[PDB]
Amino acid sequence: QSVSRAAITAAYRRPETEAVSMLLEQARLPQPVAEQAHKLAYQLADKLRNQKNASGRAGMVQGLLQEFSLSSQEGVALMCLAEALLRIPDKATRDALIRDPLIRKGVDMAMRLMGEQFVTGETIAEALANARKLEEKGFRYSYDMLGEAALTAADAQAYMVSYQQAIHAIGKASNGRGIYEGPGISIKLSALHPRYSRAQYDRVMEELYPRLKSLTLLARQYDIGINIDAEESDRLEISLDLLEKLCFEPELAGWNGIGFVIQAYQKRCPLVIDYLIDLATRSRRRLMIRLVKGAYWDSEIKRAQMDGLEGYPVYTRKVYTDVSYLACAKKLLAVPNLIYPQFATHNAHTLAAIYQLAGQNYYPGQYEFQCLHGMGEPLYEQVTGKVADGKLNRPCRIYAPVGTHETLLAYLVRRLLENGANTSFVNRIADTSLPLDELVADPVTAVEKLAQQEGQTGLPHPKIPLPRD
């Protein structure tokens, strides 16, 4: 193929100067909206960073090391002494005194230790029971049965039963609350078909498609959201063929519970949106669309460098992804009859920009925010909840991984890459030396700043040359 599908294909790996140049005026926040977004972003990031006075406290340690001149060892040493001096019960005494196999096991252990913060429960019953606390406060949940990249027919069968079981449990706990207020499920197509990574069209339709359909019908019986997670870029096209067919199932007609992730770090993203708008129209439904930046960036970069093709399917500078996300968000927000946008982010500027771009006169079913468990709750503690409690009163859906240690590894590595990259907002917020204004800097303005320095808009990362170079 159709007009929208061909345009996707044609954008696959378009040059970055071109793709970024095209997004810029779509992502640019108008004057007033920009400043209200900056203000809100600053306030969110401030409260977040300085929750327990981290910056105030940083500036005490700095101003003591500065107006007396100690190292970060001599200053620590003095606090140890000041600490003991403040265990001396009587002030008179205090003042009088002063005046006068191994590698495999470490890897597995460090994974469990680091990973636990990202997991909501070992089983679906446990995760569901831990969900009332935040659900009272106005949070929603999407449960992710951890496990992906099924290597055998047995692996895939096991994931399929774990997903079926999960939908029963989630659905019974939902109890008719529906697709917006009630819990949903997230699935990975890679879990449902053996060797998904290289699967051919015909086998996927014959074997994957009947399983996707069956889980979706079950979700529909319970009236819960069922979201298709986005994985590696070379699976985008087959995921769209599966979505298309699923949208025209007679048993799914009139039901708006189908969810689908799109990744803004891909060049194709805006063209996928045009395709999705057309699919909701032809299939007579409102699609739930999670807009994310994307989780596989390091691997996509390595992959394209080994394939030696014309270019990258993703952007090479983080700021360009940020720009693509805002442009895609505007596109999504303009067609509320056709799409329920779910704006997944832990970035305070990102959140503030969406809040402002969504316009005045919010209504619950306009959009929601989303966040990953163990990453977003502090930001969204300021967002979800009553206005009289100082909150924005916008709903947030927490993506809740559910599993034991044996399903955790791939998810955890993605989290470590996310948390540990110097470009990540969650990494920069915890840096008290980075000024709030740079942390929440507008991406479009960031890109024009580069383009004036560098001589052109949207040049690739200087350390990430084309695969052929």
Binding site for ligand FAD (CB under 6 A): 229-230, 261, 263, 265, 290, 292-297, 315-318, 320-322, 344-347, 350, 370-372, 399, 418, 421, 423-425, 461
Closest approach of Cβ 186 to ligand FAD, in Å?
Answer: 7
The answer to whether residues 224 and 182 touch, using CB atoms and an 8 Å cutoff, is yes
**Opening angle at CA 31, ends 25 and 35, nearest 5:** 120
Closest approach of Cβ 228 to ligand FAD, in Å?
Answer: 8
Helix (H) or strand (E) holding 223: none
Rank residues 88 and 149 by Cβ distance to ligand FAD and give the closer one. 149
Rank residues 410 and 421 by Cβ distance to ligand FAD and give the closer one. 421
Closest approach of Cβ 348 to ligand FAD, in Å?
Answer: 9
Q: How far apart are CA 372 and CA 345, in angstroms?
A: 8
Closest approach of Cβ 187 to ligand FAD, in Å?
Answer: 10
Q: How far apart are CA 285 and CA 179, in angstroms?
A: 13
Q: How far apart are CA 47 and CA 45, in angstroms?
A: 6
Rank residues 43 and 78 by Cβ distance to ligand FAD and give the closer one. 43
Helix (H) or strand (E) holding 19: helix 16-27
Rank residues 281 and 422 by Cβ distance to ligand FAD and give the closer one. 422
List the alpha helices (DSSP H) in 252-394. Answer: 269-283, 297-307, 318-333, 348-357, 377-380
Rank residues 84 and 197 by Cβ distance to ligand FAD and give the closer one. 197
Rank residues 105 and 328 by Cβ distance to ligand FAD and give the closer one. 328
Rank residues 115 and 294 by Cβ distance to ligand FAD and give the closer one. 294
Residues in contact with 119: Cβ distance below 8 Å, sequence separation at least 6, in sequence order: 146, 373, 374, 401, 402, 403, 408
Neighbours of 138 (CB within 10 A): 18
Closest approach of Cβ 144 to ligand FAD, in Å?
Answer: 8
Closest approach of Cβ 118 to ligand FAD, in Å?
Answer: 11
Q: How far apart are CA 322 and CA 28, in angstroms?
A: 11
Rank residues 139 and 320 by Cβ distance to ligand FAD and give the closer one. 320
Helix (H) or strand (E) holding 374: none
Closest approach of Cβ 183 to ligand FAD, in Å?
Answer: 13
Rank residues 285 and 317 by Cβ distance to ligand FAD and give the closer one. 317
Closest approach of Cβ 373 to ligand FAD, in Å?
Answer: 9
Buried-state track 303-329, b at ≥16 Cβ within 10 A, e below 16: bbeeeeeebbbbbbbbbbbbbbbbbbb
Closest approach of Cβ 351 to ligand FAD, in Å?
Answer: 8
Inter-axis angle of helices 3-11 and 236-247, to 10 degrees? 160
DSSP-derived letter for residue 108 is H
Inter-axis angle of helices 348-357 and 318-333, to 10 degrees? 20
